[PDB]
């Protein structure tokens, strides 16, 4: 197969579109099924029902807990020149 990123062998190009597993480039990437290569899909697709006298109001709720991880430090090291 020939792509804008180069030449790819060992995999077959399909016409579907899923999420991206192993990013290859130029908007295409590959995954395992055999190995296949395809074009990325940015996500789902919906057309919200806009109108000038219609609204939507929630009736229930959920409480979600999520995690976030941040590094704040690293190991303190020192070097002796003349011994090194």
């Amino acid at each position: 197969f020939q792509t804008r990123a180069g030449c790819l062998i060992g995999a077959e190009y399909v016409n579907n579109s899923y999420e991206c597993d192993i990013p290859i480039g130029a908007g295409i990437c590959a995954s395992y099924q055999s190995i296949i290569a395809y074009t990325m899909s940015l996500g789902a697709e919906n057309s919200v029902a806009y109108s000038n006298n219609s609204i939507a109001i929630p009736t229930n709720f959920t409480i979600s807990v999520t995690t976030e991880i941040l590094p704040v430090s690293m190991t303190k090291t020192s070097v002796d020149c003349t011994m090194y």
Partner: protein, 208 residues
């Protein structure tokens, strides 16, 4: 408990530091264009006048390696300092109070946060509110009554098909439109979308 690879940032910081030290140490075994990578032998194999040349080669190579290592360390330290500043701000704003800036800590309406320690970092648990189970309604921006226009003090007008109510915006809870949750401003001949209805007042029935 089961899923791994959730701590990539701390792990790869550790890996980068370890790899830097490993390559710095392993660089000690390079000739750099000299006759050997061991100093004692070249000291003990030939006279000084060329030994100085060989030591000069070794010295310049090792100095270059050390300078490269230190410069990389400085870059990485600057990045880590930026991350630590961000962590301090998040601790001060999302743990010690309720934050209003959207998506700063958690996706959804922020409620609170809790900190936990990690070997070289911090973990925030963000507790947030997420609405669900929607429902469509017909809406209008104002209500005509006696020629006057009424707007909601707080909330929004909705109708299930036959009657009109006011609700708070983020949670469906209808109430009867009254002169206590609405206010008046001018006659209704200019607003685009006014609808005819009635507004009940709680004083007239009481008086009778």
């Amino acid at each position: 408990s089961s899923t791994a690879s959730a701590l990539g940032k701390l792990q790869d910081v550790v890996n980068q530091n370890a790899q830097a030290l490993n390559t710095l140490v392993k660089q000690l075994s390079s000739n750099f264009g000299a006759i050997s990578s061991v100093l004692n032998d070249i000291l003990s194999r030939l006279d000084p006048p060329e030994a100085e040349v060989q030591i000069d080669r070794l010295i310049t190579g090792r100095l270059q390696s050390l300078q490269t290592y230190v410069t990389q360390q400085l870059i990485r330290a600057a990045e880590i300092r930026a991350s630590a500043n961000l962590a301090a701000i998040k601790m001060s704003e999302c743990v010690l109070g309720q934050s209003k800036r959207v998506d700063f800590c958690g996706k959804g309406y922020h409620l609170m946060s809790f900190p936990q320690s990690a070997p070289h970092g911090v973990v925030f648990l963000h507790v947030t509110y997420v609405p669900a189970q929607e429902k469509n309604f017909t809406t209008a921006p104002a209500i005509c009554h006696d020629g006057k226009a009424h707007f909601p003090r707080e909330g929004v007008f909705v109708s299930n098909g036959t009657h009109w109510f006011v609700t708070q915006r983020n949670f469906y809870e209808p109430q009867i439109i009254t002169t206590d949750n609405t206010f008046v401003s001018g006659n209704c001949d200019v607003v685009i979308g006014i609808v005819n209805n009635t507004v009940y007042d709680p004083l007239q029935p009481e008086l009778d």
